[PDB]
Amino acid sequence: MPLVYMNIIMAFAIALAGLLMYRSHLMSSLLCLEGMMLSLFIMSTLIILNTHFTLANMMPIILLVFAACEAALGLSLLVMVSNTYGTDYVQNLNLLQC
């Protein structure tokens, strides 16, 4: 395949890795989720433009819509976590175990 496609898939892998390996802040993980969506948008757009699937030009917009909903959902939960602990740290949410 083309060099450009490889780079976008690498971006997805890096953002996925970033999401998986947490640090202290939740907001950083939320950002990683957004990054994954951004790379998915770019990849699907490149594939759609290249093959000239005309009707599929609308699916990246739908992708963005749902990405926004997910982002909004993530920020709500962060507001509630911060209100509980005064901090958005992952370590605070250890009340429930396996």
Binding site: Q91, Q97, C98
Partner: protein, 55 residues
Amino acid sequence: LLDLIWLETILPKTTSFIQMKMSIMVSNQKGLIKLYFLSFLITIMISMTLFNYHE
């Protein structure tokens, strides 16, 4: 020596002891998503290599 000790030891007591050890190993997680998510990364890497390279 046989009924009360060794026949007890080999079949039922060994089973109880092993399952008790494995339950303690499996269920004693600290509830930190950092640790759980880190394992998910390990699992994802393993599948796409020792399962995805094999077809």
